[PDB]
Amino acid sequence: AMGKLLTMAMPKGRIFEEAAGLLRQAGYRLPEEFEDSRKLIIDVPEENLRFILAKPMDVTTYVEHGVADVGIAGKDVMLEEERDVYEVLDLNISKCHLAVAGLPNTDWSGVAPRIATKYPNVASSYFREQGEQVEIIKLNGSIELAPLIGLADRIVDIVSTGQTLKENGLVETEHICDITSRFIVNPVSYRMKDDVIDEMASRLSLVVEGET
Amino acid sequence: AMGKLLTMAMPKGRIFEEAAGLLRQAGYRLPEEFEDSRKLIIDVPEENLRFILAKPMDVTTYVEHGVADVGIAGKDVMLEEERDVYEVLDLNISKCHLAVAGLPNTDWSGVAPRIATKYPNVASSYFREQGEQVEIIKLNGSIELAPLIGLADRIVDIVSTGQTLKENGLVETEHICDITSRFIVNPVSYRMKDDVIDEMASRLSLVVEGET
C-alpha cells in the first residue's frame, strides 16, 4: 500500500476554518469536523489529500521542504520574509490584515515610543522605512498584554480590518500590510503533481475569484 | 488609589502550575484557580502581587523592561540568549529539560540530517559547537509533526527528562541543556523593591532548597 497522495499544509490559525471552507467549496470532500480536528495530520483518502495542520507561520516551511506539496499560506507565513514557494493564488477570501494598534485613547510615547510584536522582522522594517526611531520588542504571544501593562504602548500585529477597534479591545493605529493567504506550492512537488496542483489552483481560484 | 504593588511575570506554559505552587508554598495566598486562570494579568491584592501570565519565552521580556518587577523564568526564556535580569534563584522544583529527540527506532539522516525546532538559536549553536553539519529549521509549533512527516528526522526541543521516551511519543536522542526555571528580578525594579523581592527570593529558595 503506497501511491498518489497530496499533502496539503494548512495553517491551524483562525484561517484554518476559512481555508478549510475554500476546499470544501472548491469541492474537496473533507470530513465534517475536520475544522475542529485536534490532529496535526489528517487524511482525506477519498479526495487524495493528506493535511498537515501546521501552526500558520510554519505552513510555508512544510511546503518549502515539500513535506507538504501545497500550502494555504495564511500570509502570516509570508510575513517572515522572501522565500521559495510558488505563490500560486491569493485567496482573498481568508481576509484580515497587519496593523500598528494600541489601546483606545492612548497616544504614542513621548520618549522611547515602543512596539511589542511577534514580528520584529516586519515592524522593524516598517519603522526602519517609515523613519521612526522606535523600539521593537519581540513578543511570543499575549500581545494585548503589552500595552495593557505598558510594555509598549503599541503592538505591531495581525487583526481584522473592517473597522478601527480590533477584537482585542485594541484599536488600529497605523495600518501597514494588508495580507492575503495564498495557495502556495512546493516547486519540486509541483513538477511531480502539476495535475492535482493545477487542478486545485484552478478549483480554488474559481471558488475565490468567482463569488468574491 | 495607587501604591506598593509587585508585578510578577509568570510563564503561562506547563510550569505555570508548578511556578504557582512555589508561591503558594512560599506562602503567597494566591486565589484557588489562579492556576487555570484564563486572564493575562491577575491580581492578588491581599498578598501585594499582580501577576502577568506571559507566554514563557516572554517572561523575561516583561521582567527585562520592568513591566514585571519579577519573573519565574521557566528557562525556556533564558534559552533565547544572554540578557539583563538578575537570575536570583534556580527553582529546580519546576523541572524538565532541552533535548535532541526524534521518533523511536529511526536513526539520523544519511544526507542532510536535519532538525525542526522552535530554537534555532540553541540547536544551531549546539551543532555549531558539536561539529555536525546539520540543517536546522525554525518551527513555530507542532514540532512532533516535523519527524512524523519527515520535515526533519530530529527535533531540538524541550521535553521531560526522567526517561528516554518523551510525552510526545518521541524519544530523546541527544540531551543538550538541562534547564531550570529561575526567579528573576528586574534590576531597576529590585533597587526599588529589594524588600518584597529579597523577601520573595528568600521565601522561594526555602520552599525550593529545603524540601528538594
UniProtKB/Swiss-Prot annotation, chains A, B:
Gene Ontology MF term list: ATP binding; ATP phosphoribosyltransferase activity
Record's catalysed reaction(s): 1-(5-phospho-beta-D-ribosyl)-ATP + diphosphate = 5-phospho-alpha-D-ribose 1-diphosphate + ATP
CDD domains per UniProt: PBP2_HisGs
GO cellular component: cytoplasm
Pathway(s) where this gene product acts: Amino-acid biosynthesis; L-histidine biosynthesis; L-histidine from 5-phospho-alpha-D-ribose 1-diphosphate: step 1/9
UniProt-listed Enzyme Commission number(s): 2.4.2.17
Family matches, as InterPro entries: ATP_PRibTrfase_cat, ATP_PRibTrfase_CS, ATP_PRibTrfase_HisG, ATP_PRibTrfase_HisG_short
Gene3D superfamilies, alphabetized: Periplasmic binding protein-like II (3.40.190.10)
Xref: SUPFAM superfamilies: Periplasmic binding protein-like II
Subcellular location: Cytoplasm
Keyword 4Fe-4S appears in the UniProt entry: no
Entry keywords, A to Z: Amino-acid biosynthesis, ATP-binding, Cytoplasm, Glycosyltransferase, Histidine biosynthesis, Nucleotide-binding, Transferase
Homology family: Belongs to the ATP phosphoribosyltransferase family. Short subfamily.
Note on domains (UniProt): Lacks the C-terminal regulatory region which is replaced by HisZ.
Free-text function comment from the UniProt entry: Catalyzes the condensation of ATP and 5-phosphoribose 1-diphosphate to form N'-(5'-phosphoribosyl)-ATP (PR-ATP). Has a crucial role in the pathway because the rate of histidine biosynthesis seems to be controlled primarily by regulation of HisG enzymatic activity.
Self-association state and partner proteins as the record states: Heteromultimer composed of HisG and HisZ subunits.
Protein name listed in UniProt: ATP phosphoribosyltransferase
Gene designation: hisG
